[PDB]
Design a protein around this ligand. Structure first.
Ligand SMILES: CCCCCCCCCCO[C@@H]1O[C@H](CO)[C@@H](O[C@H]2O[C@H](CO)[C@@H](O)[C@H](O)[C@H]2O)[C@H](O)[C@H]1O
Ligand SMILES: CCCCCCCCCCO[C@@H]1O[C@H](CO)[C@@H](O[C@H]2O[C@H](CO)[C@@H](O)[C@H](O)[C@H]2O)[C@H](O)[C@H]1O
Ligand SMILES: CCCCCCCCCCO[C@@H]1O[C@H](CO)[C@@H](O[C@H]2O[C@H](CO)[C@@H](O)[C@H](O)[C@H]2O)[C@H](O)[C@H]1O
Ligand SMILES: Cc1cc2cn([C@@H]3O[C@H](CO)[C@@H](O)[C@H]3O)c(=O)nc2[nH]1
Ligand SMILES: Cc1cc2cn([C@@H]3O[C@H](CO)[C@@H](O)[C@H]3O)c(=O)nc2[nH]1
Ligand SMILES: Cc1cc2cn([C@@H]3O[C@H](CO)[C@@H](O)[C@H]3O)c(=O)nc2[nH]1
Ligand code: NA
Ligand code: NA
Ligand code: NA
Lengths: 404, 404, 404
């Protein structure tokens, strides 16, 4: 029952300790409090009545912003995003390119505006400040952790960019983990537009901040000593829109290519598998069979672990966007396999993160531009940081499944 | 009657003089002739029979080029831009992304071709030469003024780029005003494709050249002493297409974001306004209520000034493309408020310009790349240049409403 | 009969010799074997039973990869690329922007993956090695020739980039000719998706390698003495997708502009032609009338030479993508003029190449970045290289028509 979840949390903590750079340097206050905050934050908004109301209140607000932003894409694509599309194409009336991708543009513009006004910096300063005073983590790495709740892995360190070239290896590693453990506000609304429950996305986003620090300080404890704009609001919106556009195009091209490549792989796997009496062999089977124990460990029922392993595995070997794309049909009435509500929650939390191998190259570019003489350290800690970010997503999923 | 229009012209001239850097340095020949040309050009093509025939003749030619260019977008998007779209989606069958945006690509390619052949330089040399011999303005600032009739604010100074780093503050300010007072050939066909009368767009484009110089020399008189390629036509077209593409993507992303942001603002304004007994409070109401006296001053009837203020205000606080998008439904039979034909003309002329605050950042990049040591002067004169460009659009609207 | 084809081959060889930089320096082994290989390769896969089976076997494999890749674009555009589009828009249900362009993204990602795994380098090393041992051509120019069978003119020299800045003028010219005579794997599937027979595209791609070297060494014999990576496979796919995206956007913008410009030209040509009693005068008539002898020379029947000249001419004065776009309707049942199966083959082979004037500027950028001090030589040999690449396509067409 609930005992399998507590065992799951222990295993996840255990792996991090085994992969630590110095187990004797692990600050018990830091990693103890970081786990405590993530666990309590989960208990607050998923179990406690008042916390559930604040979560649904924030989520409904987010859901309202999405609809407002949809006026923009509705103007540009007209009837191609109207209700008439379902009367004609049925299920195929939902055009992903026009329904989901433009959201990345609107939310990038919005966040850019919220930065210009000082609203973003205000919230980050409060959250990031509360983390460092409770965990003993440094100022810069804590602000980046809090920033990662709302923005992406390359945008979050910008709030502390003059402190990045000289921050310690542990600090830099945590900054990397802050981004890998979390997502961004832009794609959050994208996944939400695909059918993923906003409550789960918002929750996993907030739990990423203490979770990211937790496994960063477990696997890479501090062994050193740390230290310590657009002309107007309309320009801010324009710059944000431009950034979101480029990003919308990149995601769209990636999805066309990756899904296409997966279709090619399955074709080959059918022929190769046929040589061993398994012509039905696909990539989903391999990933599901290999990640089933991992899915079972985080609280997924035995009879649903294999299907859950398909999505979690695909998120790891590729990215979370491709995973969500294959998981979204399981959230509709036309789902091939009806999953339990708890299993739907666990997958949503376990997928909610940028933790993948390809994110290392992205970290090298974005974070590396802030500190060009530190690209060596980033590439060195890349794989470990992905593992740490992965463990944070898995932990958040285990916690979510515990109180559900 | 016609007395309210002449008062409007006087007020617009008055504001420019009050905001001048030196009223005693204002050359009466320059500003007298510049206003005379703009006023006579208006009288010519909007009142005089022969001038109206030349205007409708040029406009029909422009309208033919658009249809020719539409063969390109029809090939690429097929039935999504056919008549069948209206039989299925009705009004929503008009997909803006495929109907309007591709025009920016075709016209950018065309203008690039017309530059390679020397056709553009020929027309500019004639118009720009006639301006300097009549106004006493310098060679470079006059050519840029004439160039701005056909191309954008960043492309126009390219015909005089080696003279830009060393031109006087008054010259540079005029070059800035030449672009802010005008639009570009690419978007002209875009606005035309949205329902805006081509005759008004062509007229306002030509009246921008003397109008831009007029308020540039009023607000910033000359107190100093002025001075004085693709391998083939197919490469020219390719480069122009590429530029138009990037530009089409930028405009599309901006519209999705800005319209989305406006929808968010209205949602908030409804809640905030509700605290003061005005739950129906929107951005259009604020802009309309605040720009109604300005609209009434340029010749809009009292009972139509508020609606006209919504579009003029939106053009100023954002850009003219967003304004035209909200004004285009008022040019159809399904218009929420039936406006007089004169009011439709005034709004079309008052909106026809790149005069907005966001254009300053664009001027800093484009025009600043031609003279990097002059970016300081550009940012300093930015706001004044926007005002000057705004006054030129308003003046052109007042004149247009006078002869109508 | 077959005598007209052999005369065609002789004329094509004759022109190259007349335009040679040194006829006395022409290596008879090189140009004799190069023609022999291209002729035998044609005889192998178009006439010989076993060769026809290997061709249809490879083509069916390519056709399977395309369908697999189409799962990506089907996910993104949903019902807009489904069969329902034909029930509603009929022929206009085929949306080029969503049917053809995304293929460029998937195949760029795939090729990028096949490079990371070492599969591409393996095949190139075998083919490129066989060429140099049989023709006596240098190592680097032979590998680039073999690489050009699968990738584009700017990507092919990358397999020998450290040898490019110091290769001889003849070597550099051959590298240029290798790209102009061939296409790329990405657009191959694009043209295939437009109705062009894959068998012809694959054949012309392979015949481009010896054909490119043939006319390179004829027109520019060697008079000097020659000499002699992404972190993971998922990053490779991502980078390839990104490159294909940018390329898909460029092609799309080019087609909108060029087709639009052609529509404008025809409008003007109708008015100009009307002055000489030819109001029906169009660009297709001019190109067809001017390229008819050339089409007749390569094996096109007298009563089909004019129509064939329209496409071949358009490919030369613009690019092969615009040509294929106007030729694709002639491959359907709704063709305005029913052409013989041999004529359809000849046009497909004669169009299958990047040989156009605009490709010189592309060569200056791509190939020039590998050797910035050699951009002078590239621009100097540009036109000659286009002619050489043109002759290779024409030769491949003559050969194809011979065995058909
Ligand atoms: C969707 C519509 C919603 C309604 C929104 C309307 C809000 C209007 C924005 C105006 O804000 C100002 O704009 C200036 C223009 O950029 C800025 O000046 C800046 O730039 C000037 C010149 O470029 C300089 O003179 C100034 O020093 C510098 O502050 C200035 O800071 C900024 O406060
Ligand atoms: C839609 C179809 C409509 C039909 C249009 C057909 C028109 C054909 C264009 C040819 O124009 C020439 O092309 C050359 C190729 O770039 C240029 O050479 C330029 O570049 C060469 C090499 O790159 C150099 O040798 C030359 O010196 C240099 O003039 C040359 O200037 C230019 O006049
Ligand atoms: C669509 C799904 C199909 C399933 C595909 C799954 C395949 C998984 C790819 C893993 O490959 C490895 O990834 C590492 C991560 O980049 C590379 O490390 C590289 O980068 C590391 C850190 O960034 C360094 O530590 C290493 O030295 C360096 O080899 C490494 O070379 C590469 O072999
Ligand atoms: C708004 C935003 C979306 C985004 C996506 N990514 C990367 O793209 C993948 C797909 O979502 C992620 O795994 C990341 O590796 C990123 O690095 N920053 C982002 N900001
Ligand atoms: C063809 C062309 C369209 C264009 C638009 N713009 C800017 O974008 C806004 C929207 O139209 C304008 O207000 C300008 O600030 C520009 O600077 N140059 C342009 N050329
Ligand atoms: C995959 C790929 C398509 C491509 C097209 N082009 C150029 O674009 C034109 C249209 O196809 C060609 O004539 C070439 O001049 C290129 O240079 N490289 C390419 N790679
Ligand atoms: Na983040
Ligand atoms: Na202009
Ligand atoms: Na090639």
């Amino acid at each position: 029952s609930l005992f399998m979840s507590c065992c799951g949390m222990a295993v996840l903590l255990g792996i991090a300790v085994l992969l630590s750079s110095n187990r004797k340097a692990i600050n018990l206050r830091t990693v103890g409090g970081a786990f405590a905050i993530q666990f309590s934050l989960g208990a607050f908004i998923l179990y406690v009545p008042w916390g559930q109301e604040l979560l649904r209140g924030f989520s409904d607000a987010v859901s309202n912003v999405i609809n407002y932003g949809n006026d923009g894409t509705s103007f540009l694509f007209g009837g191609l995003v109207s209700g008439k599309m379902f009367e004609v194409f049925g299920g195929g009336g939902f055009i992903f390119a026009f329904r989901v991708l433009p959201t990345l543009i609107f939310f990038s513009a919005l966040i850019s505006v919220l930065y210009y006004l000082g609203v973003m910096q205000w919230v980050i300063r409060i959250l990031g400040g509360g983390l460092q005073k409770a965990l003993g983590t440094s100022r810069a790495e804590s602000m980046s952790a809090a920033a990662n709740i709302f923005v992406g892995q390359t945008e979050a360190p910008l709030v502390v960019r003059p402190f990045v070239p000289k921050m310690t290896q542990s600090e830099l590693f945590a900054v990397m983990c802050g981004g890998l453990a979390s997502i961004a506000g832009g794609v959050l609304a994208g996944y939400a537009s695909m059918g993923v429950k906003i409550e789960y996305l918002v929750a996993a986003s907030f739990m990423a901040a203490p979770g990211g620090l937790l496994f960063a300080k477990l696997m890479m404890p501090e062994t050193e000593k740390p230290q310590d704009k657009p002309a107007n609001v309309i320009d801010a919106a324009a710059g944000g829109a431009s950034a979101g556009l480029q990003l919308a195009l990149n995601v769209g091209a990636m999805l066309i290519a990756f899904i296409g490549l997966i279709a090619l792989i399955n074709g080959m796997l059918g022929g190769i598998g046929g040589w061993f009496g398994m012509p039905e062999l696909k990539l989903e089977m391999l990933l599901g069979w290999l990640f089933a124990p991992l899915a079972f460990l985080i609280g997924v029922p035995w009879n649903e672990a294999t299907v859950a392993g398909e999505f979690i595995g695909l998120k790891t070997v590729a990215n979370e966007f491709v995973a969500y794309s294959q998981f979204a049909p399981y959230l509709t009435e036309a789902a091939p396999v009806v999953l339990s509500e708890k299993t739907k929650a666990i997958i949503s939390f376990a997928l909610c993160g940028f933790a993948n191998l390809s994110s290392i190259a992205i970290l090298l570019g974005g974070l590396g531009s802030l500190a060009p003489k530190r690209r060596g350290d980033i590439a060195r800690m890349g794989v470990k940081a992905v593992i740490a970010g992965t463990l944070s997503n898995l932990m958040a999923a285990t916690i979510a499944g515990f109180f559900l």
